[PDB]
């Protein structure tokens, strides 16, 4: 009953291998994995390759120009535990904290390996 519903939706939307939508010339090439990380690097080395070809006319609009530049005003320090205003920073594991009770309750009895995951959020590893 419940298991017999999904086969009905199955026989509504099948496309056979002789697909009626794609063209007669099919010729599908082999497909790599091509993750999102390596596309940045291969675009980067393509831009560097074209620049090294050109300098030995100057391109201006690139992918490194379309991203946001870093800020000029100083950033705001916040407590790593509560998200309030961080007045103090511990000298051992470099974790900002709000006041004394937060420090004695969380920061002092803290196990190693947790301070990295706390600093992961703001990227301070």
């Amino acid at each position: 009953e419940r298991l017999l519903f999904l086969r009905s939706v199955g026989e509504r939307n099948e496309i056979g291998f002789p697909s009626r939508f794609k063209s007669a010339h099919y010729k599908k090439p082999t497909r790599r994995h091509k993750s999102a990380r390596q596309l940045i690097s291969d675009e980067n080395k393509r831009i560097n390759a074209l620049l090294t070809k050109a300098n030995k006319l100057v391109p201006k609009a690139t992918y490194f120009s379309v991203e946001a530049p870093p800020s000029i005003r100083p950033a705001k320090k916040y407590c790593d535990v509560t998200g309030l205003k961080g007045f103090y920073k511990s000298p051992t594991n470099n974790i900002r904290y709000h006041n004394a009770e937060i420090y004695q309750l969380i920061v002092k009895p803290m196990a190693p390996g947790v301070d990295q995951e706390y600093l992961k959020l703001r990227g301070a590893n």
């Binding site: 005003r73 100083p74 950033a75 705001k76 320090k77 920073k89």
Partner: protein, 103 residues
Amino acid sequence: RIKETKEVYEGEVTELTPEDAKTISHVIVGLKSAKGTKTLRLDPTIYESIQREKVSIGDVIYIEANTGAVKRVGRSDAYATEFDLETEEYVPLPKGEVHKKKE
């Protein structure tokens, strides 16, 4: 009995650009409050009074238009995390206009 007008510029310094005509001819100061910003030309005597009070970019200052008095309230609150410990008091932005007029 004298009837007089009080005119006050107040806000955070954003631009401080002197220029030579060495003797400076004028200085352009840009002030910022919570309701917008406003730029002013200034005579060199007020620039001398500014140099007396050690005014830099990001300080909240007070300028009276008629007398020419310049008072430094303090560094603005947005620049308070440049150092963890500093000898500078931090005051918030004025919530009104830069220009104030009173009889």
